[PDB]
Amino acid sequence: VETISFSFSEFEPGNDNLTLQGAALITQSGVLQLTKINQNGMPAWDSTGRTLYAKPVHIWDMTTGTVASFETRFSFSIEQPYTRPLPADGLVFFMGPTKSKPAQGYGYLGIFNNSKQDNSYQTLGVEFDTFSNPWDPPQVPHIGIDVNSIRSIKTQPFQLDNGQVANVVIKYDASSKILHAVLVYPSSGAIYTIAEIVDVKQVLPEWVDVGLSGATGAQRDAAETHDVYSWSFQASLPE
Amino acid sequence: VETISFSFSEFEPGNDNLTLQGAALITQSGVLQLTKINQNGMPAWDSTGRTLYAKPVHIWDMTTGTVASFETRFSFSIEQPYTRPLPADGLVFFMGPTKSKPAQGYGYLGIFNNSKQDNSYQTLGVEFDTFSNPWDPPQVPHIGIDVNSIRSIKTQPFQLDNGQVANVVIKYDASSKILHAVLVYPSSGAIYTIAEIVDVKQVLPEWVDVGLSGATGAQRDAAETHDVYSWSFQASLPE
Ligand SMILES: *[C@@H]1O[C@H](CO)[C@@H](O[C@@H]2O[C@H](CO)[C@@H](O[C@@H]3O[C@H](CO[C@H]4O[C@H](CO)[C@@H](O)[C@H](O)[C@@H]4O)[C@@H](O)[C@H](O[C@H]4O[C@H](CO)[C@@H](O)[C@H](O)[C@@H]4O)[C@@H]3O[C@@H]3OC[C@@H](O)[C@H](O)[C@H]3O)[C@H](O)[C@H]2NC(C)=O)[C@H](O[C@@H]2O[C@@H](C)[C@@H](O)[C@@H](O)[C@@H]2O)[C@H]1NC(C)=O
């Protein structure tokens, strides 16, 4: 069995196990700030940042046809300081082709280039979307399961607890092909759940990079923070 | 669309919306004690209790072939006062034929009569099992999805936070046929998730009773409490 796992209870600056892209930065306090925070302490608009684990993960094998089961857990907080304009755009946990660079920001969250369902993306993502684009349901924020498109195959609205830490658990069981995600806010006790069938062999390449991406809006002050405090991941490929 | 819903933020003694069976009792403090608590305040062994909602729920229609999506949420606590003998047996949320009475207690949790996979049971259950029987995995406690049998089709071990309140969310999406459950302990922040494919049309009758059942052990002091503080449920059958 081929297993891979990592656990960051906090982030240390200078760590070579994470690939920081775009605006992503690790503070001295051990926080991963996906999107830019200005000197005045306010979140900057027109910002895109990603963080990828430094080693590729073997998700499935074409020869044997076996697929890996995996689980990831992370904690984040989103603070929206202004009433106007509407905050944007969100953050997303994703898996896609290795050696990838940031795609389009804003509503595309740094992982897509347009709003089409294109098999060439070879990307699976679980988004926490804060702005309603034309391809989105009217309710924001919402959790969404993205399969080769920013147009989610399933969404679940949730109430943002401004600035509070949210705990996320995402699990994929290869036998049943179920991707199940949970979001919990310890501050209010709120629990949100979402699940859908996803056959990763029809979406992802055999080896993928795993990461987090965040993005702020296309207009002045259409922004919010996208801070991550911890991140763990484990995958097991039966051989 | 045929919808049904109920929400008990607390339980009131004398309420005619709940059918209490066996040892089940609602205290003056508003707590639903599924299994017996002696005058000395200790849980009694050889006790079985259930609570069913007073109205049957339309889960699916044979004529149109449509099936309902549903969600239930409840909070409970299990206190295990002794080191020896091992505590038992657990509690379970279930759906089965209408007008049913308690079945065998102990490891059968008040909803099964033996350890066979029998289609005649017509029962679906999500258990929180505290004792390892011969049909159980060695790890206890564990969450389990029971389909016409006490021998779960899927299990997920969890660590009991003795006497602390646990929050449970169980959701069934008819379109994908996914039954997903989550258990969260606010006291420790622990989150457990479990999911599996279950086609209710192959298990349950068109109309079912929904309830909670709990049971203590077959030997002296092999017991624990099974207290429920709140319970909500909603089901929607598309027509
Ligand atoms: C977080 O980042 C950490 C820093 O990079 C990761 O730890 C490194 O993990 C490396 C594995 O990829 C590991 O590399 C090996 O280092 C050996 C020498 O260092 C050890 O022994 C020294 C004494 O001899 C001692 O002084 C050191 O303190 C270490 O104990 C070296 O012998 C190995 O070489 C063999 O294997 C390579 C292939 O991997 C062959 O090419 C080579 O011929 C030989 O057979 C190996 O060296 C690395 O080889 C590849 C090359 O590109 C690298 O430059 C070279 O370093 C390295 O020792 C540790 N560093 C430390 C300080 O521990 C950490 O990885 C996790 O933890 C390690 C221990 C391992 O279990 C990994 O699988 C884990 O992922 C990162 N953590 C995470 C979660 O990603």
Ligand SMILES: *[C@@H]1O[C@H](CO)[C@@H](O[C@@H]2O[C@H](CO)[C@@H](O[C@@H]3O[C@H](CO[C@H]4O[C@H](CO)[C@@H](O)[C@H](O)[C@@H]4O)[C@@H](O)[C@H](O[C@H]4O[C@H](CO)[C@@H](O)[C@H](O)[C@@H]4O)[C@@H]3O[C@@H]3OC[C@@H](O)[C@H](O)[C@H]3O)[C@H](O)[C@H]2NC(C)=O)[C@H](O[C@@H]2O[C@@H](C)[C@@H](O)[C@@H](O)[C@@H]2O)[C@H]1NC(C)=O
């Ligand atoms: C928790 O338990 C509560 C107590 O039982 C539930 O509330 C009852 O819900 C009954 C519905 O099943 C409801 O029954 C009706 O009562 C009507 C008379 O009472 C009202 O009007 C009076 C003035 O006329 C007023 O004084 C009262 O305070 C009430 O406002 C009565 O007219 C209805 O009869 C019609 O419908 C029946 C069929 O249901 C026909 O048979 C009949 O010919 C007529 O057409 C009806 O009466 C009931 O009929 C069936 C019979 O077996 C019953 O004995 C008889 O009572 C009842 O009014 C309320 N009680 C109260 C105090 O509100 C509660 O139900 C939920 O809330 C209600 C309001 C409703 O929305 C339900 O759908 C909800 O489930 C239970 N809650 C839950 C979550 O289960």
Ligand SMILES: CC(=O)N[C@@H]1[C@@H](O)[C@@H](O)[C@@H](CO)O[C@@H]1O
């Ligand atoms: C398609 C696109 O990028 N849309 C963006 C949206 O994502 C958000 O950033 C918004 C902020 O006002 O600006 C545009 O509408």
Ligand SMILES: CC(=O)N[C@@H]1[C@@H](O)[C@@H](O)[C@@H](CO)O[C@@H]1O
């Ligand atoms: C099959 C059966 O009822 N087994 C029971 C088990 O469920 C538990 O109650 C135990 C307590 O010591 O006693 C027996 O082993």
Ligand SMILES: [Ca+2]
């Ligand atoms: Ca959006």
Ligand SMILES: [Ca+2]
């Ligand atoms: Ca058992």
Ligand SMILES: [Mn+2]
């Ligand atoms: Mn969206």
Ligand SMILES: [Mn+2]
């Ligand atoms: Mn069991």
